[PDB]
Structure formats: structure tokens, C-alpha cells
């Protein structure tokens, strides 16, 4: 086969060991070419992790190791750390295609990290936005794990679903997740209610923050 095949995903818990397979074919690994591996952390360029089947560049931890026999290669990761989450690609050269080839990428997930409750900060509309005849409430949600939350909005005590846009959570630098929710209102809605609230549910608890148009009066 003139393509490299890797599993789409692998997972393990902190401190555990995982491996990522990559198989090729007669025209790449079978033609004598080595495998290289690249690590792509979220929102970053690929970085060389293993070259020439089993060699580590300077700085790469010895928890990463590689082997290859025939058309079968494998990247082993021992002592998994949350910092290891990302996409891992194998690479070789292929004679039938006359070019470099990459596997499809394996997403590594480190499950079972310590639970963390979200911090929630709610922002009212700015003076400038109101002068432009618009109003957006912004609910910023940080420092939570696992990376699933649900967000609910209320105007006074009534649930509001219209006008809500909520992001999918994204991992931040400290391995916890972040998300946001936006409630678009007219200036009349903002000014004519007693308050608005953002409620964030995570792992069996809900936390609620409230803002009111005359709070900083």
C-alpha cells in the first residue's frame, strides 16, 4: 500500500503507556525507507519527535520511543502526561508516488485527569456597543476538567434560548479547558430587565453569575 495507515485515536490515563501503530507497504517501508514521527500540539506547528525509526532529537523526552520491523512501525509513549495530548503523524517516502507521505494522524487523549470546577466571569454590554444600538452579554468559562459543560441563560428568572451562541470547549495552557457563551440582546431588552444570568453546569454542579444594567451606576 502506497499510503501509511495509523489509528485515528488512542487514549490512556496519566502515567500509563500507549502505542501508535503505522503500517506501510512495499513502496515505502518495504522499499527500505525509514519512518519518522511528528508531534502536533493544539494550535502549533508539527515538531519532529522520532527520526530514522528510533532516534530522538535533542530535548524530546525518552518517554517517547520508536521501532519498525518490515512494513510495521510503532510509536510508544510511556508515563503519559496531559501535556502529551495532540496529534501524532508518521511519515515516510514512497517510490510509487515519487514523494513524501504522511499517515492520517492519531489524536492522543489523556483521560482521567483531575477534576476541576469552572470559574465563570460574566460581562455586561460595553458603553460603545450600546451606542451602536447593540448589546451582547459575554460569559467566559475557564479552568475546568473534563472538557464538557452546558450553559443556560436567564432573563430575570425566565430561561432565554434565542440569541445564544456557545463555543465548544478548548484546552488551555495549564491542561484545563475554556469556553464562552454570548447572548445577543437589543438595548431595550437589556435595560428593561432586572438582571440576566449565565448558569454553567459541570460534573454534577451548577454555578450562576448575574449582571444588572444599574450594577455599576
Amino acid at each position: 500500500q502506497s499510503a501509511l495507515t495509523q489509528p485515528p485515536s488512542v487514549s490512556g490515563a496519566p502515567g500509563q503507556r500507549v502505542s501508535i501503530s503505522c503500517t506501510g507497504g512495499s513502496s515505502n517501508f518495504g522499499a527500505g525507507y525509514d519512518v519518522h514521527w511528528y508531534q502536533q500540539l493544539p494550535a502549533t506547528a508539527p515538531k519532529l519527535l522520532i527520526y530514522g525509526n528510533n532516534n530522538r532529537p535533542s530535548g524530546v523526552p525518552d518517554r517517547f520511543s520508536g521501532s519498525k520491523s518490515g512494513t510495521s512501525a510503532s510509536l510508544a509513549i510511556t508515563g503519559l502526561q496531559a501535556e502529551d495530548e495532540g496529534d501524532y503523524f508518521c511519515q515516510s517516502f514512497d517510490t510509487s508516488l515519487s514523494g513524501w507521505i504522511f499517515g492520517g494522524g492519531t489524536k492522543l487523549t489523556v483521560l482521567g485527569q483531575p477534576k476541576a470546577a469552572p470559574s465563570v466571569t460574566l460581562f455586561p454590554p460595553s458603553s460603545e456597543e450600546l451606542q451602536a444600538n447593540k448589546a451582547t452579554l459575554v460569559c467566559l468559562i475557564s479552568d475546568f476538567y473534563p472538557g464538557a459543560v452546558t450553559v443556560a441563560w436567564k432573563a430575570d428568572s425566565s430561561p432565554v434560548k434565542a440569541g445564544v451562541e456557545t463555543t465548544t470547549p478548548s484546552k488551555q495552557s495549564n491542561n484545563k479547558y475554556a469556553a464562552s457563551s454570548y447572548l445577543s440582546l437589543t438595548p431595550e431588552q437589556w435595560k428593561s430587565h432586572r438582571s440576566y444570568s449565565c448558569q454553567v453546569t459541570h460534573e454534577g454542579s451548577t454555578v450562576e453569575k448575574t449582571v444588572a444594567p444599574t450594577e455599576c451606576s
Binding site: 504522511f102 454570548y182 451606576s217
Partner: protein
């Protein structure tokens, strides 16, 4: 240190062309070949081609059917990727990478930061940026600053916070597409403020697709 630094994000209509650059530093430019590799959103790495930086010889992936050309300017230690007849499948981050020899082959040992090329017919628009604030300016309670970044196209924006000349920790949040097809996001200054003074902090919002940068350094009085 070995470093490859690429040009910024670009937007192009279908059928247009794009030229991306990659400037090398920290080693002898002509001693190592340069490869280009792309990554369409959420997808796998795809080799584009190779240029010998000494003599200019090139090799390409058959997938591009003559639509890509690589070139080099040794006086500028720079390589260029020119991709023509752009289509929707060409929206991707384009990387350059240095080819390094070891005993039994070549590997890609150092990579540029990538340049996002977006193929779109929609107008490019710079963001509006609003200073937003949680808390008031009466209790021993934290004030939190953020910037709401809205109405821009395409993605993405880059945000940095300063106190004077000193960059400050921030919290980044995902971008989301609004019903009107423009994008919005927020950036929060990470540390709550105990003693707020005007003009001390600023948020700087870069949108390279519109060659624009906006800084907000005043949080006016609340309504």
C-alpha cells in the same frame, strides 16, 4: 537557533494565486533543502514539494498538477511557494520545513509557524473591538478586563495584552461564527485588578487577513 519564519495569513478568491514566503535564519541557508507541507483544516499533512536552496532544483507532489512553483532567493535566505488556480480544497495552513540528513535518510527537523491561506469569495472585514469589564470601579472585589472582538472575516485574530511594554497573561477563547456569517471571540486579561487606573492596560488585536491592528487602552465609564 535554527528558525523558519513565514509570511502572514492570506485570503484569495477562487481562481486566484497566492505566494507564501519562508525566511530561514540561524544556519547556512544553502546547505539544507526546504520542503513545503500543507494541512487543510482538521485533516492530514500533505507534502507539496521540495527546493534545493543552493541550485534551485525543485520536485513536486503529483497532486498539484502543475499549479505549484517553488523558488528561492539566497540573498534573502527565503523560499517561496506560489500556488495558482486556487480552489476551496486549497484552504489550508502551509508550512515550510528544513530537510536534515542523518546516516540513512532525511527528516524534517525544523518547521515554520505556518501561514493560513483562506480561499473565499466573501469580503474581508477587520474586527470591531469593545472594551468589556466585570465588576465595578465599591467593594473589595476583583475587576476583570476583557476585549470583545466581533464582526470580522475570515478567521483568525491574535490578541496580546500589555501593561506598559510588558506582555501580560491572558485567557484565550474559541472563535465562533455568528448567524450573520462574521466571527466573534473574546480575550480576557488573566489577573484580576485590585487597583484599576485608566490607560495602564491595553489589549492589542491583530487581524492579518485585513492587514489591521487595533489597540484599546481606555475603559470608559459604564452606562
Amino acid at each position: 537557533q535554527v528558525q523558519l519564519v513565514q509570511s502572514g495569513a492570506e485570503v484569495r478568491n477562487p481562481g486566484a494565486s497566492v505566494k507564501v514566503s519562508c525566511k530561514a535564519s540561524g544556519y547556512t541557508f544553502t546547505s539544507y533543502a526546504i520542503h513545503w507541507v500543507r494541512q487543510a483544516p482538521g485533516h492530514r499533512l500533505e507534502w507539496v514539494g521540495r527546493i534545493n536552496t543552493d541550485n534551485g532544483n525543485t520536485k513536486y507532489s503529483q497532486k498539484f498538477h502543475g499549479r505549484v512553483a517553488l523558488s528561492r532567493d539566497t540573498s534573502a535566505s527565503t523560499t517561496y511557494m506560489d500556488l495558482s488556480s486556487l480552489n476551496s480544497e486549497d484552504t489550508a495552513v502551509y508550512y515550510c520545513a528544513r530537510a536534515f540528513y542523518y546516516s540513512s535518510g532525511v527528516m524534517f527537523d525544523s518547521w515554520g509557524q505556518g501561514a493560513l491561506v483562506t480561499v473565499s469569495s466573501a469580503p474581508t472585514k477587520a474586527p470591531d473591538v469593545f472594551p468589556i469589564i466585570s465588576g465595578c470601579r465599591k467593594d473589595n472585589s476583583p475587576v476583570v478586563l476583557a476585549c470583545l472582538i466581533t464582526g470580522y472575516h475570515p478567521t483568525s485574530v491574535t490578541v496580546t495584552w500589555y501593561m506598559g511594554t510588558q506582555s501580560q497573561p491572558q485567557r484565550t477563547f474559541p472563535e465562533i461564527q455568528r448567524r450573520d456569517s462574521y466571527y466573534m471571540t473574546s480575550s480576557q486579561l488573566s489577573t484580576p485588578l485590585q487597583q484599576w487606573r485608566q490607560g495602564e492596560y491595553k489589549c492589542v488585536v491583530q487581524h492579518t487577513a485585513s492587514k489591521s491592528k487595533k489597540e484599546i487602552f481606555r475603559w470608559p465609564e459604564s452606562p
